[PDB]
Amino acid sequence: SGFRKMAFPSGKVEGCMVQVTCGTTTLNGLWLDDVVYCPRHVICTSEDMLNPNYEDLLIRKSNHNFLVQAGNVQLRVIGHSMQNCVLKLKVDTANPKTPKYKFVRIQPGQTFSVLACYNGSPSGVYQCAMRPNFTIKGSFLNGSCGSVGFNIDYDCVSFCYMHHMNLPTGVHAGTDLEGNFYGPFVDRQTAQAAGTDTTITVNVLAWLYAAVINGDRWFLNRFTTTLNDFNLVAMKYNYEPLTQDHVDILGPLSAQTGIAVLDMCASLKELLQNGMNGRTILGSALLEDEFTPFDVVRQCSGVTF
Amino acid sequence: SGFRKMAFPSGKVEGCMVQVTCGTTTLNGLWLDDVVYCPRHVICTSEDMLNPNYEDLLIRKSNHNFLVQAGNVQLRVIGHSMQNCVLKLKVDTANPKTPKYKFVRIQPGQTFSVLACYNGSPSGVYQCAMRPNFTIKGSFLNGSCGSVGFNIDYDCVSFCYMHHMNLPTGVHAGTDLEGNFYGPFVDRQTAQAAGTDTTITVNVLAWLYAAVINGDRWFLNRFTTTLNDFNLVAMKYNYEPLTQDHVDILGPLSAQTGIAVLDMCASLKELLQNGMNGRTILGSALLEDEFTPFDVVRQCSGVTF
């Protein structure tokens, strides 16, 4: 009973966090096997950060200039390479706490837990979504860079995010664990246009299902609709279009709730067109698009790790 | 930049969770040193739960009837006692992962992270507040009972909550780690009147400060007010009264934000009386009372553990 924004357990990831210092700059890093992953902007000084040539800056640097503190204990850097926008420091020790893990790139709309860190020390954990414009709405102060986002599949930790930039706009940008930015971003302190953000339609849908499951059901209407009809209204309200794929993903919830996806769409249209009239759905006055269909089923069916 | 609802890192607590089975019933338990803490309602069968005499039921039970699975591994129960509404099973092994810890009772308004569990396995983590009527608004399915809530002070884990009841109303009740229920609750499947819940005034205040810190500041007015004046309006909107103590606690934020508590109150009164007019404060259409003054300073100043 009840339904909340819920992060994964952070333990396994906690034991992979390390501090990485280079000259002045210090930030977080991820220690897996004999390799530590971190942002290359560690090697920038303030001036560089306006337009760094990352080729030239690294050439000047050598193993011994990379200080990698694993909590209390130093680690011996024995090699370094740069893969897109990430840095990869090889070290004599393999992390004994290395979990079962993968690196995945995620699609916009998919959620993950962030473990926010300063000086390689865990600070707090929260759930986020990859916004359609490839930004995230997290909580990141100076030093948060290097913090990772991840999912868990029973015992396996898919890392999907590493934080790099706090955009002038106060949202957030970063890379997959192969250094490729999510979105049109680059690692340099400049003005950077992030696009129109739209609302993640399938998630909201999935969120309404959870509500019905939890007895918030005032929003249920008799009406039905069609994809074409609804999308026409979505576009109007900056919602992503809806696809058969989305519907297919919303299938299990339909089967259990006994509410056909397209009637739910009906409910949504009404909300969009009419607002909520001072009503709340699961203690929120607006609609929540940061819950995947999967996210609901896990929470509602009580999956453990 | 940005500001979110953020739980503590769950690792240290993760390694204290164990499954506890007795007859049919199975639920979570907390293994610390050679002691495992769990709800006594484990020893109830369905029928008992309408009106269990906990004295008589335990008398019938003996050590060997308590199955305590530590993930994979069984533990040898070598003694048992009942302390108010908690059960305390002594075992030959002391948990090697036992963290530095305390047990605290918390006051209403104070927040903590819940680690929701099924079969002694971590499921997910979220932040909660002790509502003025001593309920919580979490996410708890059958088996969630035994899950604990806690805070962290650098390296020390104050446990403040263990979950027992999912109330007919769809909110939640439980004990401190000495078994004394928070609130007027008891461990029996009956209708249980939880009181009027009011809104946690100081928290909302503290929350507005974070907003201003994050550049949401449209709600800032020129007006000022007094305690007496404001409280008069609070009572009207079911807000807890405000005390010099609350103000004293809001002092640091005032000093850094340069906004005197009582002007902030001014802003709040206006919001209460006028609503938000379709505006949002930190991506919420209503006001957030589940953030302590401490909670803001940690997040905003970036404290680690």
Author numbering:
A (entry chain A), B (entry chain A): 1 to 305
Can you quote the paper on this entry?
The SARS-CoV-2 main or 3C-like protease (Mpro or 3CLpro) is essential for viral replication and is a promising drug target. The Mpro inhibitor, nirmatrelvir, is the antiviral component of Paxlovid, an orally available treatment for COVID-19. The E166 residue is known to be a potential hot spot for drug resistance and yeast assays identified substitutions which conferred strong nirmatrelvir resistance and others that compromised activity. As the E166 site appears to be a hot spot for drug resistance from in vitro viral evolution experiments, we solved the structures of two substitution mutants Mpro E166N and Mpro E166R, revealing how E166 mutations may compromise activity versus drug resistance, respectively.
Toward addressing both questions, we solved the crystal structure of apo Mpro E166N and the complex structure of Mpro E166R with GC-376 at 2.3 and 2.1 Å resolution, respectively. Both proteins were crystallized in the C2 space group with one Mpro molecule per asymmetric unit, and the biological dimer can be generated through crystallographic symmetry. In the Mpro E166N mutant structure, N166 forms a hydrogen bond (HB) with H163, an interaction not observed between E166 and H163 in the wild-type Mpro structure. This new HB prevents H163 from hydrogen bonding with the glutamine side chain of the substrate, an interaction crucial to substrate binding. The binding of the substrate would therefore require N166 to adopt a different conformation, breaking the HB with H163 and increasing the energetic cost. These observations are consistent with the drastic decrease of activity in the E166N mutant and lack of toxicity when expressed in yeast bringing to light how residues outside of the catalytic core can influence substrate binding. In contrast, E166N and E166D displayed severe reductions in catalytic efficiencies of ~84- and ~74-fold compared to WT, respectively. Expression of Mpro E166D and Mpro E166N did not cause a reduction in growth and grew as well as empty vector controls. These results indicate that Mpro E166D and Mpro E166N may have defects in their enzymatic activities. In turn the crystal structure shows that the asparagine prevents substrate binding through a new hydrogen bond with H163, providing a mechanism to explain the significant reduction in activity.
